[PDB]
Amino acid sequence: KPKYQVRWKIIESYEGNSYTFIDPTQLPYNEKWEFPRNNLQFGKTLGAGAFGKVVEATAFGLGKEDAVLKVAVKMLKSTAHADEKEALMSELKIMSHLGQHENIVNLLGACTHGGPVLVITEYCCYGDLLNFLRRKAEADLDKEDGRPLELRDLLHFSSQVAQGMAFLASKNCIHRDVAARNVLLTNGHVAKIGDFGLARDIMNDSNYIVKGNARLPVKWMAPESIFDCVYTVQSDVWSYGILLWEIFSLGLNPYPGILVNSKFYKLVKDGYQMAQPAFAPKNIYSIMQACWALEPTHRPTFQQICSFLQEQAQEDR
Missing domain, CATH: 1.10.510.10 (Transferase(Phosphotransferase) domain 1)
Incomplete structure (x- = not known):
């Protein structure tokens, strides 16, 4: 259209000499990441693009009940092209799947119920x-x-x-x-x-x-x-x-x-x-x-x- 997409790939293999990549669509969303929308206190926009924006938020009770933690939350626009809505989900998924590292922007959680999909990352x-x-x-x-x-x-x-x-x-x-x-x-x-x-x-x-x-x-x-x-x-x-x-x-x-x-x-x-x-x-x-x-x-x-x-x-x- 074009649509929003992140262009990361993960190799399955491996055997060609040709690469076959993981279809992130088929990856399962692990519900452990779920975080209540209302436990986020939204703040300043860190950046707003054509497909959505990235907003700074304060998270309460993430990984520990008393924790107070400044986070970055990704979201698409209200007029999201039906997916996209999935690309954001893919998202997330590829990114669950990788696990944590000091020198990558880490996934901290997601909001998948009670409104549009939100992806919480490190601020x-x-x-x-x-x-x-x-x-x-x-x-x-x-x-x-x-x-x-x-x-x-x-x-x-x-x-x-x-x-x-x-x-x-x-x-x-x-x-x-x-x-x-x-x-x-x-x-x-x-x-x-x-x-x-x-x-x-x-x-x-x-x-x-x-x-x-x-x-x-x-x-x-x-x-x-x-x-x-x-x-x-x-x-x-x-x-x-x-x-x-x-x-x-x-x-x-x-x-x-x-x-x-x-x-x-x-x-x-x-x-x-x-x-x-x-x-x-x-x-x-x-x-x-x-x-x-x-x-x-x-x-x-x-x-x-x-x-x-x-x-x-x-x-x-």
Whole structure:
């Protein structure tokens, strides 16, 4: 139409050489997540998109009777396209199924009776990584005032996302939209990877380009995804290299000013790459370059990258 959808996938297998993915529609909703709508106290909108919004709420009695806890709750618009209504449910499901991790935005519960479906996730008080970076980069002190960004901060964001990604990969999960806009920062500026597409307006985002069938983040995509339509863990690693660029350029748009052709697609497949970002050390740039290997199997792994970046961040004796 297009409709709202999150583009995560989970592999069943495995055996082709072809992938068969889980149909989330057939997954069961575990009722353990159910939370009373009235035990939520709604607050400010964290982001409102074309298909729905993401709202901050205060939850009472979640996981413990006395608990008071700031949460993020996802919801669709009143005029929801019949499903969608299911995509939000899928949702949820894929996400039950994955389990918890420190560096992913975690599911906390859901409201499925007494009104429209609500999905309760972890609240992230500093918002998305992209805006944070851009807000610290802007030169005006009435807006932002704080400690100056340093290399160690950028390494922390990078290793924290890599770790979250290493987890998903371990659980046969392909994100399909790793990007600074989808990394959210929690207490102590700890990075978490999720999907914040509901909060954004996809129809007027120059990052999402009509590629025949759908509207895809082509600048963050491996050549074989464009191609060719192949998505893998290695394909998410390519997107991570783009994310690395996003981080070490402090929020600049990838391939800045490049006319997204053709042609552009062919040039990338024939091995065009972005120049070194302003604030990337040579050795971080060489991670980017490795993430953009034309041979998917020559790309590094999230765990490798994670370890390397945790090592680099280590303050000397």
